[PDB]
C-alpha cells in the first residue's frame, strides 16, 4: 500500500480520493491518505469550502514515484509534487502514520468499484491526453476545455481527447455517405480502433477517463467525449462481441456510481434514449439498460 502525505491543510476543503470524499477543516492537523491500493491509477481531488468554483485534482500512480500534496498560498491551491529523496519521504510518512494524522483509503474487501471504473485507464495514456511532461502526475479541473471544444483557448491547458465528429470527412468515406452516416462501423473499426487507438482497451480507457473527469470535476467537455464514444459504438452495426459485452460492464458500473442527484447534469437524454432504444446495439446492453431503467426512469 502507498501513501500521499500532505504537508498541511491551511484552507478548509472537501478532498476526494477516487469515488470517496471527506471534509478537512481550516488548519486541521491533517497529513494525508494512506493504504492506497497499488495496481490502479488514482485521482485526488479538491473543492474549496469558501469557493466551490474550480474543482481540481491530480491523476497519479504510486508505482511511478513518491507524491505529496502541499498548499501554495500564492496560487491558492493544493499542489501535487514529487519527492525524489526516498529516505526523506519514507521518514515523513512514517512519522505521520505513527501520529495517526492520516485517513485510510477505505476500500471494502468485496468492493471492486474502482477497478471496474478504471479497468482500462493507464497513467501513460492519461499523460498523453493531459500534456505536462515534466510531471509524472496529471492536473485536471472543472474548466479545462477539450481540443474539440477549442476548434469550435490556451492549448497547453487543454484536454487532448481524440476528436469524434459524425459529420466530418474523417467519419465519412467519399462515395459511402449514406452508408457511413447511418452505420458508423467504418469510423469505429477502421478509423478509430485500427487507426487511432490501435485496440479496444485504449478506446475504453479514454472513455472511462472521460467519464471520471466529468463526474469528479464536472468537466463538461469530458462529459461530451464520454457520450460521443458511447454513441459511436452503439451507432455501429458491426462491433466485436467482446467489445459490446465489455461496454455493458463499463457503463453499468459508471451508472451505478453516478450520484443520483447529478443525473440531470451528467446524462444526455438524447444519447441514452438513442443508444438503449433506437441504435443498432439497443439489445446488446442488457445490464446497463436494466440499471438505467430502475435508477433513472425519468431520463427515459
Amino acid at each position: 500500500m502507498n501513501t500521499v502525505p500532505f504537508t498541511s491543510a491551511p484552507i478548509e476543503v472537501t478532498i476526494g480520493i477516487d469515488q470517496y470524499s471527506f471534509n478537512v477543516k481550516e488548519n486541521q492537523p491533517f497529513h494525508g491518505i494512506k493504504d492506497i491500493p497499488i495496481g490502479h491509477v488514482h485521482v485526488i481531488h479538491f473543492q474549496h469550502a469558501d469557493n466551490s468554483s474550480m474543482r481540481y485534482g491530480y491523476w497519479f500512480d504510486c508505482r511511478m514515484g513518491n507524491f505529496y500534496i502541499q498548499y501554495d498560498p500564492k496560487d491558492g491551491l493544493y499542489k501535487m509534487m514529487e519527492e525524489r529523496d526516498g529516505a526523506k519521504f519514507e521518514n515523513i510518512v512514517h512519522n505521520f502514520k505513527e501520529r495517526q494524522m492520516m485517513v485510510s483509503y477505505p476500500k471494502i474487501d468485496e468492493d471492486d468499484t474502482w477497478y471496474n471504473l478504471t479497468e482500462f485507464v493507464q497513467m501513460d495514456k492519461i499523460r498523453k491526453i493531459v500534456r505536462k511532461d515534466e510531471n509524472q502526475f496529471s492536473y485536471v479541473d472543472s474548466s479545462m476545455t477539450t481540443v474539440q471544444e477549442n476548434e469550435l483557448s490556451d492549448p497547453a491547458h487543454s484536454l487532448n481527447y481524440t476528436v469524434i465528429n459524425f459529420k466530418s470527412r474523417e467519419a465519412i468515406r467519399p462515395g459511402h455517405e449514406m452508408e457511413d452516416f447511418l452505420d458508423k462501423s467504418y469510423y469505429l473499426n477502421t478509423v478509430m480502433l485500427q487507426g487511432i487507438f490501435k485496440n479496444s482497451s485504449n478506446y475504453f480507457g479514454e472513455l472511462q477517463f472521460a467519464f471520471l473527469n466529468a463526474m469528479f470535476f464536472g468537466n463538461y467537455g469530458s462529459s461530451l467525449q464520454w457520450h460521443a464514444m458511447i454513441e459511436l459504438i452503439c451507432s455501429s452495426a458491426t462491433v466485436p462481441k467482446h467489445m459490446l459485452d465489455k461496454l455493458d460492464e463499463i457503463l453499468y458500473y459508471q451508472i451505478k456510481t453516478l450520484p443520483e442527484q447529478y443525473s440531470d447534469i451528467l446524462l444526455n437524454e438524447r444519447v441514452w434514449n438513442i443508444c438503449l432504444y433506437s441504435s443498432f446495439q439497443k439489445n446488446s446492453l442488457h445490464n446497463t439498460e436494466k440499471i438505467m431503467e430502475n435508477k433513472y426512469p425519468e431520463l427515459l
Binding site: 459529420k167 466530418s168 465519412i172 467519399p174 455517405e177 449514406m178 452516416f181
Partner: protein, 237 residues
Amino acid sequence: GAMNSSNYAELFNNDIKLFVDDTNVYRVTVHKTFEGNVATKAINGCIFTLNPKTGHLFLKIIHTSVWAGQKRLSQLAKWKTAEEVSALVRSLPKEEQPKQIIVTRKAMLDPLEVHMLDFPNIAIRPTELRLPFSAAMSIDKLSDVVMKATEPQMVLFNIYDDWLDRISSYTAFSRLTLLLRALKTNEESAKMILLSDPTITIKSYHLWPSFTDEQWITIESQMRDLILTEYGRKYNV
C-alpha cells in the same frame, strides 16, 4: 441559419443560392394485389433545384430504375437527392457554384450536409417558408419530360420564361409561388384560368402563357381568388 420572412430579400441578392425540393423524387401509386394485399408502384420523379434570382431550374429526372432492388426507399430518396445536388455543384464552374443551398424540408439537412463535406463554405440551410414546389409536376411541360424519361436525365429550364425582362426577381418569385400555390390548391381551376383565353399561347420555348403586363395582373387576381375560394370551401367560411 433558417430562411424566413424577415430575411426574404436575401433570396434576390447577388450571392448565388439554390432551393432544393425533394417532394417529387420518390413518387408511387398504391394498389391492391391479387391476394388482397397492398403494393406500391414507383413512377418517375424529379429533384427541383431552383436559383430564385435567375429562374434557372436544374430538373434532375429520377427514373424508376434507381429504386430497383433497394430498401427503405423514402430514406434512400433523401440521400439520392443529396448525391445528385452534390454532383450538380461539382459539375458547375467555381464561379457558378452556390454559396448557400436552402432545403424546403428539414429531413434533407443531414443528407445534404454529409454529401457536401468537401464544400465547407457552402451553407446548407432550412426555411420556414411554406413553398409550393411540390406542384412543379402540375406544369405540363415539366410533367411531360419526367414521365417520358427512359433513363436518368437532367433538363434545364428557366422557370420564369422571359419575365425578368420586365419584372424584378422578387416579383417573379412571387408570381411563381402564387401560380404554384394555386395549382397545388385546385389544379383544374388554376389550369382553366391560365388557358381560358385561346388567343394567349405558351411559346414553344416557355412554360407559361405569354401574358401582357395587364393580363398578368388579372391572372394573379384570379389565382388569389381561387386560393381564397378554396380556403372557404375547406373551412366552411
